[PDB]
Amino acid sequence: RSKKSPMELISEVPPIKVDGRIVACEGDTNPALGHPIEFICLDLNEPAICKYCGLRYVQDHH
Amino acid sequence: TALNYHLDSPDNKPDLPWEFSEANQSKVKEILSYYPSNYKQSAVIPLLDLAQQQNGGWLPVSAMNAVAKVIEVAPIRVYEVATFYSMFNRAKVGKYHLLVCGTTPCMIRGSRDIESALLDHLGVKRGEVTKDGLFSVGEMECMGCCVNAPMITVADYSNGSEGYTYNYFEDVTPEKVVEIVEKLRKGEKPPH
Amino acid sequence: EKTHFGGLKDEDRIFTNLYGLHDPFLKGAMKRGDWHRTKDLVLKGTDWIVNEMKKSGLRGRGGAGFPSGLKWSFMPKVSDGRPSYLVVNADESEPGTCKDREIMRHDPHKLLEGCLIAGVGMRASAAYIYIRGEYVNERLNLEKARREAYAAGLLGKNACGSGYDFEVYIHFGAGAYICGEETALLESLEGKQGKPRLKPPFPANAGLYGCPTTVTNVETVAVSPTILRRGPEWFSSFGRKNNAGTKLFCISGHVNKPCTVEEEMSIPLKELIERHCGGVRGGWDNLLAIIPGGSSVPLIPKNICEDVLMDFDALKAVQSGLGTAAVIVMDKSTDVVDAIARLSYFYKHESCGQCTPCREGTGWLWMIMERMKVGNAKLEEIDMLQEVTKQIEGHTICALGDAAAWPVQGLIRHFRPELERRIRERAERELLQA
Amino acid sequence: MDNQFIFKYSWETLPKKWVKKMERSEHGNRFDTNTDYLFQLLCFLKLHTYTRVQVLIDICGVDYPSRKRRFEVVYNLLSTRYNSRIRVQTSADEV
Amino acid sequence: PYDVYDQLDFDVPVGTRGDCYDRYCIRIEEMRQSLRIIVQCLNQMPSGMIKADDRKLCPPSRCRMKLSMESLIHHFELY
Amino acid sequence: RNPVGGARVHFSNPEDAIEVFVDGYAVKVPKGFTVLQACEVAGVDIPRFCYHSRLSIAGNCRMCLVEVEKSPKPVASCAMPALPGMKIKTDTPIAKKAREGVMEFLLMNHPLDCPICDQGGECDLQDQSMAFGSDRGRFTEMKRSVVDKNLGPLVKTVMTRCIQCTRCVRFASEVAGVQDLGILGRGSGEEIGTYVEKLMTSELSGNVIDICPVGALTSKPFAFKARNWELKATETIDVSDAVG
Amino acid sequence: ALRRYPTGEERCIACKLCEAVCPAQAITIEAEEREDGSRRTTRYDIDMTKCIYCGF
Amino acid sequence: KRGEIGKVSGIPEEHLSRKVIIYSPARTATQSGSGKLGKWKINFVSTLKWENPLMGWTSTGDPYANVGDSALAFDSEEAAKSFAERHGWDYKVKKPNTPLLKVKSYSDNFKWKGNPQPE
Ligand SMILES: Cc1cc2nc3c(=O)[nH]c(=O)nc-3n(C[C@H](O)[C@H](O)[C@H](O)COP(=O)(O)O)c2cc1C
Ligand code: SF4
Ligand code: SF4
Ligand code: SF4
Ligand code: SF4
Ligand code: FES
Numbered sequence A: 001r002s003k004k005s006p007m008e009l010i011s012e013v014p015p016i017k018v019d020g021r022i023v024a025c026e027g028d029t030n031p032a033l034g035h036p037i038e039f040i041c042l043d044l045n046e047p048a049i050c051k052y053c054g055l056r057y058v059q060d061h062h
Numbered sequence B: 001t002a003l004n005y006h007l008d009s010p011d012n013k014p015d016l017p018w019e020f021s022e023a024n025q026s027k028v029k030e031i032l033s034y035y036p037s038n039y040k041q042s043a044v045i046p047l048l049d050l051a052q053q054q055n056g057g058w059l060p061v062s063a064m065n066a067v068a069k070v071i072e073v074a075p076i077r078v079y080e081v082a083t084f085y086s087m088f089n090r091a092k093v094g095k096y097h098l099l100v101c102g103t104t105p106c107m108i109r110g111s112r113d114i115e116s117a118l119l120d121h122l123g124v125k126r127g128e129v130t131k132d133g134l135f136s137v138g139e140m141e142c143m144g145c146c147v148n149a150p151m152i153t154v155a156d157y158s159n160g161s162e163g164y165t166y167n168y169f170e171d172v173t174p175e176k177v178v179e180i181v182e183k184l185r186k187g188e189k190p191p192h
Numbered sequence C: 001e002k003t004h005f006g007g008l009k010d011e012d013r014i015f016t017n018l019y020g021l022h023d024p025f026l027k028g029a030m031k032r033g034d035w036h037r038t039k040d041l042v043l044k045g046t047d048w049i050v051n052e053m054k055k056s057g058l059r060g061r062g063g064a065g066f067p068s069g070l071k072w073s074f075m076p077k078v079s080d081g082r083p084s085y086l087v088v089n090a091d092e093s094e095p096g097t098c099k100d101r102e103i104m105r106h107d108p109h110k111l112l113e114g115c116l117i118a119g120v121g122m123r124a125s126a127a128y129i130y131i132r133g134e135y136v137n138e139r140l141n142l143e144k145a146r147r148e149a150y151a152a153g154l155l156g157k158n159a160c161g162s163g164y165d166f167e168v169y170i171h172f173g174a175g176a177y178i179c180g181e182e183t184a185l186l187e188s189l190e191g192k193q194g195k196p197r198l199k200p201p202f203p204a205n206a207g208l209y210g211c212p213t214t215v216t217n218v219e220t221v222a223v224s225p226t227i228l229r230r231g232p233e234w235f236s237s238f239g240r241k242n243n244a245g246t247k248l249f250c251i252s253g254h255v256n257k258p259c260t261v262e263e264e265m266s267i268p269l270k271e272l273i274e275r276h277c278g279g280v281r282g283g284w285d286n287l288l289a290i291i292p293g294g295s296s297v298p299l300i301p302k303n304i305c306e307d308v309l310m311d312f313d314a315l316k317a318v319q320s321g322l323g324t325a326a327v328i329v330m331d332k333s334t335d336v337v338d339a340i341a342r343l344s345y346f347y348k349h350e351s352c353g354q355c356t357p358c359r360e361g362t363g364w365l366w367m368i369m370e371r372m373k374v375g376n377a378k379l380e381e382i383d384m385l386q387e388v389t390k391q392i393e394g395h396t397i398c399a400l401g402d403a404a405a406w407p408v409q410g411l412i413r414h415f416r417p418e419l420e421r422r423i424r425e426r427a428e429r430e431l432l433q434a
Numbered sequence D: 001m002d003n004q005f006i007f008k009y010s011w012e013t014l015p016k017k018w019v020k021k022m023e024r025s026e027h028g029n030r031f032d033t034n035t036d037y038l039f040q041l042l043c044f045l046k047l048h049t050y051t052r053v054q055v056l057i058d059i060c061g062v063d064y065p066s067r068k069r070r071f072e073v074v075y076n077l078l079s080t081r082y083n084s085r086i087r088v089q090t091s092a093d094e095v
Numbered sequence E: 001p002y003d004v005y006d007q008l009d010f011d012v013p014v015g016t017r018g019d020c021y022d023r024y025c026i027r028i029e030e031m032r033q034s035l036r037i038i039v040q041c042l043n044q045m046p047s048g049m050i051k052a053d054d055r056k057l058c059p060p061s062r063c064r065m066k067l068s069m070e071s072l073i074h075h076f077e078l079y
Numbered sequence F: 001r002n003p004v005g006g007a008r009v010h011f012s013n014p015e016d017a018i019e020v021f022v023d024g025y026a027v028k029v030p031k032g033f034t035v036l037q038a039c040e041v042a043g044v045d046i047p048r049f050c051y052h053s054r055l056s057i058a059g060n061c062r063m064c065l066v067e068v069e070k071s072p073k074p075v076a077s078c079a080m081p082a083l084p085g086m087k088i089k090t091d092t093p094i095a096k097k098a099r100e101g102v103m104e105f106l107l108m109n110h111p112l113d114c115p116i117c118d119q120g121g122e123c124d125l126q127d128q129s130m131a132f133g134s135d136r137g138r139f140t141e142m143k144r145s146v147v148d149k150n151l152g153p154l155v156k157t158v159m160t161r162c163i164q165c166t167r168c169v170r171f172a173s174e175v176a177g178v179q180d181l182g183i184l185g186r187g188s189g190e191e192i193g194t195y196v197e198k199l200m201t202s203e204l205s206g207n208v209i210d211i212c213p214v215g216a217l218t219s220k221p222f223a224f225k226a227r228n229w230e231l232k233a234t235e236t237i238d239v240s241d242a243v244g
Numbered sequence G: 001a002l003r004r005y006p007t008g009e010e011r012c013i014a015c016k017l018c019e020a021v022c023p024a025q026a027i028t029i030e031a032e033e034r035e036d037g038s039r040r041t042t043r044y045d046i047d048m049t050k051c052i053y054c055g056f
Numbered sequence H: 001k002r003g004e005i006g007k008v009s010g011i012p013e014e015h016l017s018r019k020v021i022i023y024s025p026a027r028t029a030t031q032s033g034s035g036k037l038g039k040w041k042i043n044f045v046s047t048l049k050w051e052n053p054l055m056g057w058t059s060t061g062d063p064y065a066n067v068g069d070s071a072l073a074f075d076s077e078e079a080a081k082s083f084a085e086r087h088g089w090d091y092k093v094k095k096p097n098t099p100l101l102k103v104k105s106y107s108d109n110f111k112w113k114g115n116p117q118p119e
């Protein structure tokens, strides 16, 4: 599809659930084919958006 | 759950009024009468400790502003002091705040065993009160010589600033910690 | 004597009644001799006390070794308006050492009168006692003793029947290891973050409130009441040319019956551990390692722990100085890597994060210890660890960075084969399980 | 025939007042004359037996818009039989 | 000789007369010598890295600049 | 040897001008003028992160370390007062090692977000890392991260890339005059914020963008609009207010 | 070709390294912070007449 | 004016009457290094730029759009003045601002703050 702009297309992707306090995002599954590694400290009540990917991460429980 | 930021809760808000007490004014004046009048900021630590005792062991944002007003400084100069030190509980804590042994001089004799019992039996997640605020678990730093390995520290915030005590118990055991927690729940203080 | 620097006859000790034998509030203090003939002690000039300190050969106690008389001499002789304060480092930080809590609980008037003697020695104006926040009982006992002293008339205006006045106040911190530092003490007492300031503005020039102040340890000033009344030669002839004063020791660790009595400071480790505190758990045979002094000291193994003294010069010559003089023995039944890793984590926990080499270096050391404890590291990691410790030490604002780099350096200098064995067994397991 | 030997020889053999300044380095040997004794210097360097510089590689040019003598032309030379390189340069002007 | 040419073995064809035919023969012989040098370089090919390491004038490996801070800084300030 | 940037040394009295040696070179500086300023007069430029000419002097970040012959350990040139006749030299291998170690420590926890950093082309951290700093860092474990707070609609903050130099704190305390910014916490993990949800409401509060070397504090309206190298810089004056 | 993430977000973050390294000066980029919050390109065009396909 | 070099430079006579500014670029505020200072530049006022109405590119009609930026950097003010007068340009020199080194010691954060006199 191409009717949806990427800004409106990334928002519908469900946020990832992480058990820990910080999660490292590397883009693609292969580290060398994604963006530089980014450690995000997810502590607020809102999802933490990866600045490169746009992926969102939500902490469920410690 | 140690956070350096507020995210205001309905329990504690900056606009909520907070004074020390009618009787505590004498203590405030006495503690302020230790330093030169221009250096009223030197009493920030004792005033914060007194506010923590008066509130119940947890220091809210309103009491921080009240202390800042008393010493006539910017409010953040009190937030910095309160956050830096390890004896200013910023989140709500129960009346009898229990504590765990220190890391390097205590764990040598194998004191990790007791804290497992404290967190597992009759306990909830660390830093959390029960259905009602009675007990809580935190980290504690040893006074000195760990001549006795298992040591539990309690803080008496039940009676406020008048009945505030800071006692240390040595030779604690999974059964001894039990009998002491029911003794505290009953009300009578244990011996040390 | 000189062949052996040992033997306490139970009347050569200074801190009598350190077990709460008698009520140490006013009557016991008066009985043992506290507040005795203090009128002439403080009325016999000011430079006499400084000369007494200089010739008595007093050493820095409970911290960096430094001649106490020379340090006191740095205070201004004529005051250009700025009042002189005297803050006592009553903070008993670095857990594992309790040589000050016991003194506070059982000899309050000792230190309380030592404050007055030191203040008249350096023309001070007021005394500040900074007790830990976790010493509520000790603080209450000390303030009760101070209230009794105020009632008697030994302090305040016209102290001890002398024209000179004095003041002793009680300030209690809030439980930070860095707050025990000689400058973070002043920063916290000023009522702000307890982060040490830089060295060139020495406290003797501009300290508390910007006024010339001097920081002394509680037990370093608590031997001042007994340096004049009992004379200087009563203890200065106990030890070495500059190492004398009957330093207190707090033995602890994996040894049965841990005593805490004071002794001569030039005592061999073997004699002190097999005479007073029974013997090492399991005997002298195990004797994995020992730390002379507190937890801020480089490690000393079984090879060189014997036939050396608790003297600052010789211990420094064994690249492992004397700190607060509270040793912790290590037996063969406990791994030394885990204890040193826990020491590194303790240093990481209390670093006030001001200067860069300590702020991130103390965390990097902890991560390296966690990796190496289970053998997850490689063989080449030891040299990088040495380089990291060398980078940390010498570049920090205060000495905590050195205190955090010393234990790991001592471990990798005296227990390198243990790390190599752990690495080798991890590698062989890795190659065995496919 | 190497850098140092040529430096000694051209320091001794060359008549003075020709080379305003000279350099010796691994990058290249330089002979900065004074924009008038150029034909003479090149003629000597071409015909002398111990310096048989025969081929002129190129004539460079550098524009420095900060000095009084704005331009600076560079003469690259080469001695085939001695297997050595000499870089003679001057200072020019826009008029 | 600039690169590794002392190790390599080859001949330098030199003409006798300056006519065009000898230049053609010289070029043919130069092609022969180039083939010989290619064979020698193919035979004597060592292993190791291709980019320099002494100075910082080479980009970091794209599998390295994505997890290191100094490497990413070098990549940025070089490109 | 002209002073770096042509800075004019201010002599209150020519009699009070001590002489120090930087690198085989004597120079005259009056009372005060900590070692860093003595090198500034001598023409040698010293790396710095925390020291600013208009704010106070703080000894953290330990980057301006130099070597003095009469000194057991390297001293901070940004806070060491000038003494008559020192040997303050920076060419020694010990100074290079100290600077390399300090930069390794600074870049230990720095995030890899250079391509998205608004201060990418003009960052003081990477410019000094290229010049005064060893390559091929050794850190490989997880690096600390902190959450992005909110303060003002004209100062966009990303504190995961903050080196705790306390420059903004000192600016807010001294020059701005309103004390709403401060350094909270203890040890590695100390966030520099307000502890509440207040915004920076000061007249000259937008100057924290310039003083903060790394791209932690950057302007929000200009966020992600252009890079440094593609802007033509011209020097004009102001017309809004009468101070010109 | 401008590739994009498997999720659907475009891979370009307007870092402008390509614009600053292009020897032919073919690439012209204009960036802007989206209302989402992340940085992206609003105008990223390449002059294929200037481009030399050098792979820089 | 001594603009005889303008007759020989071959540049068009219309650009021989430009008004230029000679100045030393100031240190950028965002970065604390002083490595780009001490250099003087000639600032041709090439302020005429517009937008191509197909792709938004920036167009120019003035050949001196970036000459003074990319090239033509002088080491001294007198060199720039001599160059401008030789090429015949109405140069207007602008003096550079320089920071003033004031005495500031570390032991200034710790003062008396005054005596508690009644106020
Ligand atoms: C990080 C750090 C913490 C310290 N904590 C204490 C302490 O808790 N108690 C103490 O007596 N000395 C402590 N010291 C040593 C101090 O330097 C010492 O108290 C002070 O210099 C007075 O020395 P003196 O006993 O010779 O008078 C500490 C030093 C450092 C670097
Ligand atoms: S070395 Fe550590 S404890 Fe000492 S000032 Fe620096 S950060 Fe603070
Ligand atoms: S602040 Fe500097 S080093 Fe950090 S990401 Fe931005 S440009 Fe890179
Ligand atoms: S926000 Fe900027 S100025 Fe403030 S401490 Fe961090 S790096 Fe320094
Ligand atoms: S701006 Fe250019 S180099 Fe940077 S991500 Fe986008 S296409 Fe790639
Ligand atoms: S040694 Fe156990 S609590 Fe400190």
Ligand code: FES
Pocket (backbone or CB within 6 Å): F047, F048, F049, F050, F051, F058, F059, F060, F061, F062, F063, F064, F065, F076, F077, F078, F079
């Ligand atoms: S620049 Fe001097 S210590 Fe930071």
Ligand SMILES: [Zn+2]
Pocket (backbone or CB within 6 Å): A025, A026, A027, A035, A038, A050, A051, A052, A053, A054, A055
């Ligand atoms: Zn990502």
